[PDB]
From a paper:
[name] is the only known intrinsic positive regulator of the complement system. [name] stabilizes C3bBb, increasing the half-life of the enzyme complex 5- to 10-fold. Oligomeric full-length [name] consists of ring-shaped vertices, formed by N- and C-terminal domains of separate protomers.
PN1/456 in complex with C3/[name]-[name] crystallized as long rods and pyramids. The two “stirrups” provide additional [name]-[name] interactions; the TSR5 stirrup interacts with C3/[name]-[name] through cation-π stacking of Arg329 with C3/[name] Phe1659 and a hydrogen bond between Arg330 and the main-chain oxygen of C3/[name] Gly1660. The TSR6 stirrup is partially disordered in the absence of C3/[name]-[name], but well-defined in the PN1/456-[name] complex.
Numbering used by the authors:
A (entry chain B): 28 to 90, 93 to 132
B (entry chain A): 254 to 472
C (entry chain C): 1516 to 1522, 1525 to 1555, 1558 to 1612, 1618 to 1663
Write the structure that this text describes.
Amino acid sequence: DPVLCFTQYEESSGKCKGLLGGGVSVEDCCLNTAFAYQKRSGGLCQPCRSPRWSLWSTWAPCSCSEGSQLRYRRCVGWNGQCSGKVAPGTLEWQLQACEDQQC
Amino acid sequence: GSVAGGWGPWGPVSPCPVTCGLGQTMEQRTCNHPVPQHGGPFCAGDATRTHICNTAVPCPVDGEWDSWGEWSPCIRRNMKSISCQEIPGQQSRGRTCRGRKFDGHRCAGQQQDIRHCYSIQHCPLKGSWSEWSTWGLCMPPCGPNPTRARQRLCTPLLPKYPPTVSMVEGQGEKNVTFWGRPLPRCEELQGQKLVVEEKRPCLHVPACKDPEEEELAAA
Amino acid sequence: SNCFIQKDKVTLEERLDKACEPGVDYVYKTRLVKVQLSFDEYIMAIEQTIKSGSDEVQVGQQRTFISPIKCREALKLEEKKHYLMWGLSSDFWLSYIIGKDTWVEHWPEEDECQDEENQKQCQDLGAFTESMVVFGCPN
Ligand SMILES: *[C@@H]1O[C@@H](C)[C@@H](O)[C@@H](O[C@@H]2O[C@H](CO)[C@@H](O)[C@H](O)[C@H]2O)[C@@H]1O
Ligand SMILES: *[C@@H]1O[C@H](CO)[C@@H](O)[C@H](O)[C@H]1NC(C)=O
Ligand SMILES: *[C@H]1O[C@H](CO)[C@@H](O)[C@H](O)[C@@H]1O
Ligand SMILES: *[C@H]1O[C@H](CO)[C@@H](O)[C@H](O)[C@@H]1O
Ligand SMILES: *[C@H]1O[C@H](CO)[C@@H](O)[C@H](O)[C@@H]1O
Ligand SMILES: *[C@H]1O[C@H](CO)[C@@H](O)[C@H](O)[C@@H]1O
Ligand SMILES: *[C@H]1O[C@H](CO)[C@@H](O)[C@H](O)[C@@H]1O
Ligand SMILES: *[C@H]1O[C@H](CO)[C@@H](O)[C@H](O)[C@@H]1O
Ligand SMILES: *[C@H]1O[C@H](CO)[C@@H](O)[C@H](O)[C@@H]1O
Ligand SMILES: *[C@H]1O[C@H](CO)[C@@H](O)[C@H](O)[C@@H]1O
């Protein structure tokens, strides 16, 4: 079922650039592994190269007293797995104790 | 008699520019269906658009190193075991060039890493307790009742061995690293011989929301 | 075959044992710079002195390896290729004779070592080389 095919993946921002067009299978788009796709306008952008982990996000807001904050990374790419045999798209999480001030 | 223009059909006007995968061609149409006549307006919009051409041929894929495998056992030629002894060994780890297809490029640099080692695998060593580790992550990070932990470990005292071994061939020397899981011998701390673990809950833990879907919460 | 040590395939333990046999006075990593056929005179550049002997060769110097016409097909040496070589004190002429007691092994080029058909040999030679240079021969 068809996808938006793009000629560039921008690793800094994880953004799809250089629209070729739509109405193509991901298989046909990714015949060239330098390309990238979106399933739906606004959707996540997936590079056609072999999967690997994104860099961890910054630590989210802490919720004055000691709470806890999430950071996340995603397995981004096509036709493979990341470390733990993880399929492309998959988010992985870390949770941490955090302190802002001392109310 | 004031007849407004109408677009005829799209037809291709350039060849597929690429020798593998998808590329861009150009289609073109004429304002001849019908032709504008007697002050009739010209057709609205574009006489040309991009169109995707499919070679159905895969492009070359350059190879990428996977990460280093584990260090092989620390051993020396014509010695059954060197563990628990002041005897430099040798060990290696390797990696594969994965992904290379259709005459794409090979990986750059070394498929093998070699170092020298002292084996303390299953060696009994006197053990001193670490002070407390820093608090670990909250686990499970999403699943229910996230808990945190820190440890005092029965840390081994490594033999005071040379950092380096003289070579036989060069005038040079080579680094020797301690390798292997030894058996550290501590007196009991909190009636434990290896590991003392504290745990406490994580406070005011947020749900794991997918960034892609998040801030589409009207509810 | 009395042309060279004809070689079950060769293991790392095997290779470390044979290069430490009595009389083995040189072990070289070599590049075949130029053949000149006729006894054939194989002009070898020395890349590594893995073991040095009677002949105090500096690295990046050349030595002629002689071999009978009869042994050209069996040796099958191609120019610009790399080889692991070792032999006896006895096989010294300065130049070297290739005989029944001479090890000549094709050493794959660093790029073609990544090929599945080469991975084990290249791992073994890297390990062999390191053991020989650092530890030497036993006894
Ligand atoms: C024509 O023959 C093909 C088999 C490839 O060798 C082509 O090279 C590839 O061209 C695309 C752009 O069309 C690049 O993105 C690829 O990286 C390049 O390898 C060749 O032009
Ligand atoms: C060897 O150890 C020394 C310690 O002074 C260090 O500088 C060097 O990076 C090490 N080299 C290798 C190859 O491990
Ligand atoms: C996240 O974890 C660390 C940084 O905290 C690094 O190993 C890497 O940046 C990863 O994406
Ligand atoms: C041609 O372009 C579009 C149809 O694709 C309309 O604006 C109109 O038919 C015009 O003539
Ligand atoms: C070109 O675009 C589509 C067909 O691809 C239709 O709107 C029509 O054929 C037009 O000429
Ligand atoms: C192997 O070596 C180090 C890890 O010890 C990193 O450079 C990387 O993981 C590589 O694959
Ligand atoms: C070998 O060396 C240490 C373990 O001794 C770690 O860096 C890792 O296991 C590597 O493979
Ligand atoms: C851990 O507990 C306290 C607080 O960190 C310290 O006194 C000491 O480091 C101990 O090992
Ligand atoms: C864990 O608790 C806090 C940080 O969350 C610190 O007091 C210290 O690092 C401890 O190990
Ligand atoms: C390790 O360290 C603790 C504190 O020194 C002791 O209680 C234990 O017996 C072992 O020496």
